[PDB]
Amino acid sequence: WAQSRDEQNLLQQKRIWESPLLLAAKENNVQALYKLLKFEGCEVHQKGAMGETALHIAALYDNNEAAQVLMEAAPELVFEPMTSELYEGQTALHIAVINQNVNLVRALLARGASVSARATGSVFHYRPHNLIYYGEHPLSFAACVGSEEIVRLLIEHGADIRAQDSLGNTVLHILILQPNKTFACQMYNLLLSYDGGDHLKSLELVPNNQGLTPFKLAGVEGNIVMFQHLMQKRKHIQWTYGPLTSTLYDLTEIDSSGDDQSLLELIVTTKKREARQILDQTPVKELVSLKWKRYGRPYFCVLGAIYVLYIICFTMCCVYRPLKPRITNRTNPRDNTLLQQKLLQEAYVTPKDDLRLVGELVSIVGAVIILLVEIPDLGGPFHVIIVTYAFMVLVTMVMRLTNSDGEVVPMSFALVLGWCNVMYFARGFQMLGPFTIMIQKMIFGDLMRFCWLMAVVILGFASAFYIIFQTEDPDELGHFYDYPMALFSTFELFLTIIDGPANYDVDLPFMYSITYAAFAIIATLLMLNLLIAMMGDTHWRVAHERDELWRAQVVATTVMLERKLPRCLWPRSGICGREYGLGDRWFLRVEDRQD
Ligand SMILES: C[C@@H]1NC(=O)N[C@@H]1CCCCCC(=O)O
Ligand SMILES: [Ca+2]
């Protein structure tokens, strides 16, 4: 697709060269325009490759003199849009506004150029392959280029500030997506000066297509300067006492009032890393910290202690499995067999089997409660593991009443997944909070690397060892008696967790010694190169990323507890302004001291 516009831009230059009229508009050749327009009559309404006219070209390459000749000879060219799909709807005013040719913009508005002309072409879409997004209407173009002179000039000729684009963005929504945050604030206020001024139907209230007010969209995008600027409109200073200043905050669009209306709801769910810095701002960080000091952290430990006991209950039923002898003399055929099956679905006969029964009941009513609170739909795996555990418990009860060969298989998965999910609660316990994020974040980046290389390394060394020792006999060495043991023993050899094959009475093959020396070296190199390469995440910037991602996890977990738990506990944050002076809204008291 990108080659098409590359072809079309190259094609347009060819059509500009071929057409002697369009070339004069590109090169500002006033002398040639008069000879073509007047003496040797040429098609003045000439359409170019991009469906453009000579006036579109005269505005692209800032040539006011050539543009004025075309308008004095054919003033209807001003209203003509670009017919091409890439530039559907663009007019010569859009081009003159974005190039800040005020004299051409002034002269174009004299011809009555439509200020409501929408530029709906594909190069004007809010897409990553487009380098800018200024909206559709010419007023938003002037707002994004920072030309305040053209902005008021377009308003004077009847520009509507409430104009929404394809994505329902008002001119305020578009300014927040612009890079220059420090200069767009002054431009932002200039547009609000032409607002209706009434307390209702303010332009700051018109939401996005995704249901986002300009204030709320600024927080999601991570725009700090606009979020700070928009905050002045909703904070009220109570009094000034020396260095102390007590400020009251409106807290309306920030708190979790509506189901999805909450701004905090949007900050924890969005993918932008810059949005993490919004909960550090001075309306939010005081709020989210008060929600964690009281009603947040204490309930998390309560739910933590409950889940830990529930796992101990399930763990106790797994250590006290049904017990039974082997009931078969199968142990001698394939004499390596070591099993003593213990499965028997006795009716009751319970001196203490009823004790583990209610534990199997707690585990069932627990796994079904777990499965009925998460499936009715950062903390990713630690919430996908619990449902996998609850799945295993229900499958284990289906392994019961069927008592298949692998009774331990789905039950063993529930033990590791049940305990390794207890360190989910690490996110709210100070010391190991960021630590769990550390072990969680590398499982993707620094684990898949060196794992695909460890796996590929053993498939060369493990397969060698089997060749060296299927000629020998499994009786004395036996580390590589079949192929699966060759892979599994060498894997353990890679981590040095087993002792390394060594038999000094017998004589080992002369190929084992050379291969293992190379294995012992390579296994240490890739092991040391896992350590020092995984060490790069120790920059003092990561010192924030270790911590400020843990604070983000605490804030994200704080939002989780308040949504599901009833309103009887965890009252609404702040103080309701009703029964005070500020009508039925909730406010937060924050006082500071400036040095
Ligand atoms: C230069 C082209 N010639 C023309 O007459 N209009 C085009 C303007 C190019 C703007 C592309 C904006 C974008 O990347 O979306
Ligand atoms: Ca050892």
Numbering used by the authors: 29 to 405, 420 to 637
Text taken from the publication that reported this structure:
TRPV6 and its close relative TRPV5 are TRP channels that are distinctly Ca2+-selective and play an important role in calcium homeostasis. Structurally, TRP channels are assemblies of four identical subunits arranged symmetrically around the pore axis. The transmembrane domain of TRP channels includes six transmembrane helices (S1–S6) and a pore loop (P-loop) between S5 and S6. S5, P-loop and S6 form the KcsA channel-like pore domain, with the ion conduction pathway lined by the S6 helices and extracellular loops connecting the P-loop helix to S5 and S6.
TRPV6* crystallized in a nearly identical crystal lattice to TRPV6cryst and the overall shape of the molecule was very similar. Despite these similarities, to our great surprise, the structure of TRPV6* exhibited the domain swapped fold observed in other TRP channels of known structure. Therefore, the crystallographic data unambiguously demonstrates that the TRPV6* structure is domain-swapped. Apart from the distinct connectivity between S4 and S5 as well as S6 and TRP helix, the domain-swapped TRPV6* and non-swapped TRPV6cryst structures were almost identical. Similarly, both the 2Fo-Fc and robust Fo-Fc omit maps for TRPV6* demonstrated completely different connectivity of transmembrane domains compared to TRPV6cryst. In TRPV6*, L495 projects its side chain into a hydrophobic pocket formed by residues of S5 and S6 of one subunit and residues at the S4–S5 elbow of the adjacent subunit. By contrast, in TRPV6cryst, Q495 is rotated by ~120° with respect to the orientation of L495 in TRPV6* and forms polar interactions with the hydrophilic pocket formed by S4–S6 and the TRP helix of the same subunit. These observations suggest that hydrophobic burial of the L495 residue plays an important role in driving the domain-swapped fold of TRPV6. Despite these gross similarities, kinetic analysis indicated the rate of increase in Fura-2 signal is faster in TRPV6* compared to TRPV6cryst.
